[PDB]
């Protein structure tokens, strides 16, 4: 039945079945299963057909469900947007009449308006599309007609306000990407030329109308208009006063009027100072009446309704905007000082609301104020600076707010890896981390303004924690975060005294408190605070040693979270105070590093493997600070002894019998050892080479064998075997091997030694093993690893680039050539490797068989045709860099041009005119611009048409024109000629080139027929000529 219904709907030789369409749409909106998808497909196919609109009227004459009416209106809107320029003028007039009549009829009936608002909105949008197509050339009296119709009736006035709001939105807010530059400018000029009547109507309705819905709609339309209208209509009329007096205080107009006032305040001009001062004064006067300063805004928001919460948010937005814009203007008026303070009070009140976004707005204002005051004079409490003198009464309130609501410094997330490993990870730059950073910057500025007040606030908070009045884990955590955030904001002596007092009080609190949980919380807070003040620990060796020994003691504590906190604090201190563990400290016989290494076995006996890896990384940070080469080597040897024992035992077992490598426990041990090695390499850096040199070959022997096993497994039970724990462990071992190699190579400062020693073993252990592996078993990281090596070696690995390709290139291409989806990681890493080779080893490309170079170019073209954004961007970057490199080498430049220039241009134009590849438009333009400049300067000294030795520029003009005409037959010859002339003229102005490309992209989606009026060929040609003249002048200069 469904297929027959679809065929009947798509069969335009028979009358449409309205009942069938209603049933199909009802199934779509209330279906269950494949029926809904089939209905979607049928409706999409019916809409696609060019003759669908021939039935739309019939639908609107017989449809009962509003969904079908919406579908018909969608078809009509598509027709108007696309083919309005090729329809007969009689059909256009008929559509105009039908749309206007339907709008009027539906808006006339209040019951119909209430029942269906989506229908009314769709009809208004269709009308706005018609206006964009025709007005004002074919509808010069639309504005006056709608103004008169609105003045006659109130419902018609409301509908006309909605229509005008939509028109303003479509002409000024969402024009880019839907209207060409010339037509957009024409529409904007037309809208601005006839705005006096619209503004007069809006003022009349606001001042006289008593119909609340109509006033609300007018206010929304005015809010939309404020984005673009000339300033005279705002700052030279009764608009601000009318909004503040007649609507701001009204409960049902407060939100929209406040939004309008915020938009007005956001404006920044140097000739309407009096108007801005009046706006601020009157708004403050109204707010004091509708929102008393004694109100608890936090509780009001918590128990407030949606309107109340929105009003509080809009009030915060308005205050922040106006203050950040005209604080200096308001400050200059002495009589307004109190008012200004009141404004600040309001901010503080809103700062107590338990809402993240409102607090973010308030904190943005607070950060701006603190930064301005700090820039005025960074010194602490000479005469106080003027602005600081003005703001002194509430800076302590801001400090209290900052200390009382400090955000968590770091975010920790437990994530399951690809292989099923549970890993703790630190988020780098998220919303919450940004919030903490802003709060910390504000508090640091305030502390720099004066540290006594901040210290007093912190001491009071700590006292209240101690005495139990304000005791809680949350409050203690917040106070300790606030204490840590201000590290480095005060002098060393004041910092030392304050920190000694704080630590003494915290230790006393820990002593007094009872229970394991409270003691753990307080101890964790103490460790966090001491870890945030590295200068304090560096100054006092006894305190540093005590802290480190306490951390080692905590590392044996099985209470939840204590071991992780101890390891994190230990690594933080080791990173910050690394230089104090290698030297001999007063009162010590040997450096603390030797003491730690001697007892490393007893320290980590209780740690979990991830904590052990963190501990090893911290110790490696300490080791890397040893400047002496011999002592550093001895420390490294003594440092890897425990992992090396297990490594050697496993290697001997494997040599005796390779089957041991199939034992899961051995694989877990190997993975742990390699993770430890990776962390140690990251911490130590280049001098870690020796450790790598000790295991490298053996590692490569464990890798390859394991790899083979994986492949065999896949050949025995298919890809599903990859889900088994043993294969996951083997893949973990392989990936850790690759990670260790990549990390050391990246951190190694010796390309020659790397190329001589560590690459040749790779060529056979990993690359050829990668080639021999089945496609399912190939490890993508291999490719990425190689990329890193290339990025570090460049000219030192060029000779080996051919061989590397013979191992990875072809076998990889056949994996990512059948579609754009399968093996995403392989595509990403392969094209990253190709980018590295192109950027650092271009002579490798210049010294390979021409067939191989053609394959590489085809791979790049396949790259920038990808739906994946990263792959396409990498392909475009590769292409641009390749073009630059080819231009650099004169010998092969002409050959490369004559072989690939036209093909690359054709592919670039194919992607450019595709809607799916708009995200890379910038790059597209750049490439195209460069190419055309290359063809216009004369760099290509050989004609691209050997049969016809014609000028390169003329030949390229004709070639591109013909290519575009064939691709888009519906385009006009003048359109294509202008587009090509702009391509050849705007090649030295990338923003203009991109705008030209966007104009062409919007043009090719509309059937302009033979109408040349909307093309504005004269204005576009004048603009292109001006750009050409400017570029020529720049060239002459």
């Amino acid at each position: 039945l469904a297929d027959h219904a679809a065929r009947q709907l798509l069969d335009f030789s028979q009358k449409l079945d309205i009942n069938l369409l209603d049933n199909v749409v009802n199934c779509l909106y209330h279906g269950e299963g494949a029926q809904q998808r089939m209905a979607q497909e049928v409706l999409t196919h019916l809409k696609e057909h060019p003759d669908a609109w021939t039935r739309v009227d019939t639908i609107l004459e017989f449809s009962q469900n509003m969904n079908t009416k919406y579908y018909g209106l969608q078809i009509l809107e598509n027709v108007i947007k696309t083919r309005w320029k090729i329809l007969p003028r009689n059909q256009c007039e008929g559509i105009k009449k039908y749309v206007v009549g339907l709008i009027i009829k539906t808006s006339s009936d209040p019951t119909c308006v209430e029942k269906e608002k989506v229908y009314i909105g769709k009809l208004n949008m269709i009308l706005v599309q018609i206006l964009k197509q025709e007005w004002p050339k074919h509808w010069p009296t639309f504005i006056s007609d709608i103004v008169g119709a609105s003045r006659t009736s109130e419902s018609l006035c409301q509908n006309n306000m909605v229509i005008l709001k939509l028109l303003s939105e479509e002409v000024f807010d969402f024009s880019s990407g839907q209207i060409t530059q010339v037509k957009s400018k024409h529409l904007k000029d037309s809208m601005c030329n006839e705005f006096s009547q619209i503004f007069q109507l809006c003022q009349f309705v606001m001042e006289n109308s008593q119909n609340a819905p109509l006033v609300h709609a007018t206010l929304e339309t005015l809010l939309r208009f404020l984005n673009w209208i000339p300033l005279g209509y705002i700052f030279e009329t009764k608009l601000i006063s009318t909004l503040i007096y007649k609507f701001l205080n009204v409960p049902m107009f407060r939100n929209v009027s406040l939004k309008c006032l915020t938009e007005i305040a956001g404006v920044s001009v140097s000739q309407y100072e009096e108007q801005f001062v009046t706006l601020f004064t009157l708004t403050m006067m109204q707010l004091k009446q509708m929102l008393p300063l004694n109100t608890n805004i936090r509780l009001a928001y918590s128990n407030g309704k949606d309107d109340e919460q929105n009003f509080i948010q809009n009030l915060s937005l308005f205050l922040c905007t106006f203050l950040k814009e005209h604080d200096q203007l308001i400050e200059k008026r002495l009589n307004l000082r109190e008012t200004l303070m009141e404004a600040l009070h309001y901010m503080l009140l809103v700062s107590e609301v338990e809402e993240t976004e409102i607090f973010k707005i308030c904190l943005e204002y607070w950060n701006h104020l603190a930064a301005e005051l700090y820039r005025e004079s960074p010194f602490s409490t000479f005469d106080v600076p003027p602005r600081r003198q003005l703001y002194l009464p509430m800076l302590f309130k801001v400090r209290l707010l900052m200390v009382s609501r400090m955000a968590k410094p770091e975010e920790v997330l437990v994530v399951e890896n690809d292989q099923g490993e549970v890993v703790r990870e630190f988020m780098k730059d998220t919303d919450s981390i940004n919030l903490y950073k802003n709060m910390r910057e504000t508090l640091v500025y305030l502390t720099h303004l004066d540290y006594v007040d901040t210290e007093r606030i912190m001491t009071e908070k700590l006292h209240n924690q101690v005495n139990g009045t304000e005791w809680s884990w949350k409050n203690l955590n917040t106070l300790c975060w606030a204490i840590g955030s201000i590290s480095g904001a005060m002098h060393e002596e004041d910092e030392k005294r304050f920190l000694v007092t704080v630590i003494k009080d915290l230790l006393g609190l820990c002593e007094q408190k009872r229970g394991k949980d409270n003691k753990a919380i307080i101890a964790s807070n103490i460790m966090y605070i001491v870890g945030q003040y590295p200068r304090f620990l560096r100054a006092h060796w006894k305190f540093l040693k005590t802290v480190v020994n306490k951390l080692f003691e905590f590392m044996h504590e099985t209470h939840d979270g204590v071991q992780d906190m101890a390891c994190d604090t230990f690594i933080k201190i080791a990173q910050k105070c690394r230089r104090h563990f290698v030297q001999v400290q007063v009162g010590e016989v040997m450096p603390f590093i030797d003491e730690i290494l001697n007892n490393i076995n007893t320290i980590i006996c209780d740690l979990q493997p991830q904590q052990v890896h963190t501990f090893y990384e911290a110790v490696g940070y300490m080791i890397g600070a040893q400047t002496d080469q011999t002592v550093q080597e001895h420390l490294i040897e003594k440092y890897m002894l425990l992992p090396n024992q297990v490594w050697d035992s496993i290697i001997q077992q494997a040599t005796k019998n390779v089957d041991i490598l199939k034992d899961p426990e051995t694989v877990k041990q190997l993975g742990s050892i390699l993770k430890t090695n990776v962390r140690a390499c990251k911490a130590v850096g280049h001098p870690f080479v020796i450790q790598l040199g000790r295991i490298y070959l053996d590692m490569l022997n464990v890798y390859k064998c394991l790899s083979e096993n994986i492949s065999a497994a896949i050949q025995a039970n298919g890809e599903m075997v990859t889900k088994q724990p043993l294969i996951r462990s083997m893949r973990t071992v392989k990936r850790e091997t690759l990670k260790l190699i990549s990390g050391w190579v990246s951190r190694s400062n010796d390309p020659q030694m790397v190329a001589e020693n560590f690459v040749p073993p790779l060529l056979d252990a990993v690359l050829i093993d990668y080639q021999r592996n089945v496609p399912a078993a190939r490890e993508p990281e291999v490719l990425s690893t190689m990329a890193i090596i290339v990025n570090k070696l460049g000219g030192h690995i060029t000779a080996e680039i051919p061989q590397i390709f013979d191992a990875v290139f072809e076998c990889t291409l056949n994996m990512i050539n059948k579609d754009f989806e399968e093996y995403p990681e392989h595509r990403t890493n392969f094209f990253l490797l190709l980018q590295a080779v192109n950027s650092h080893c271009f002579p490798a490309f210049l010294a390979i068989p021409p067939t191989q170079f053609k394959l590489v170019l085809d791979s790049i073209i396949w790259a920038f045709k990808h739906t994946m954004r990263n792959v396409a961007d990498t392909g475009l970057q590769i292409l641009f860099t390749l073009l630059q490199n080819v231009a650099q080498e004169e010998a092969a430049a002409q050959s490369f041009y004559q072989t690939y220039f036209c093909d690359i241009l054709q592919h670039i134009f194919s992607v450019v005119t595709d809607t799916s590849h708009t995200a890379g438009l910038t790059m597209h333009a750049s490439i195209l611009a460069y190419m055309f400049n290359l063809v216009e300067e004369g760099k290509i000294s050989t004609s691209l048409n050997p049969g016809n030795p014609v000028n390169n520029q003329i030949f390229l003009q004709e070639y591109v024109a013909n290519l575009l005409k064939s691709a888009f037959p519906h385009l006009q010859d003048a359109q294509v000629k202008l587009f090509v002339t702009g391509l050849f003229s705007l090649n030295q102005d990338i923003p203009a080139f991109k705008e030209h490309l966007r104009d062409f992209l919007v043009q090719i989606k509309e059937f302009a027929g033979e109408d040349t009026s909307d093309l504005f060929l004269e204005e576009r040609e004048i603009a292109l000529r001006q750009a050409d003249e400017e570029k020529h002048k720049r060239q002459m200069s």
Partner: peptide, 6 residues
């Protein structure tokens, strides 16, 4: 005067 760029 003239409209303002958004």
């Amino acid at each position: 005067s003239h409209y303002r760029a958004v």
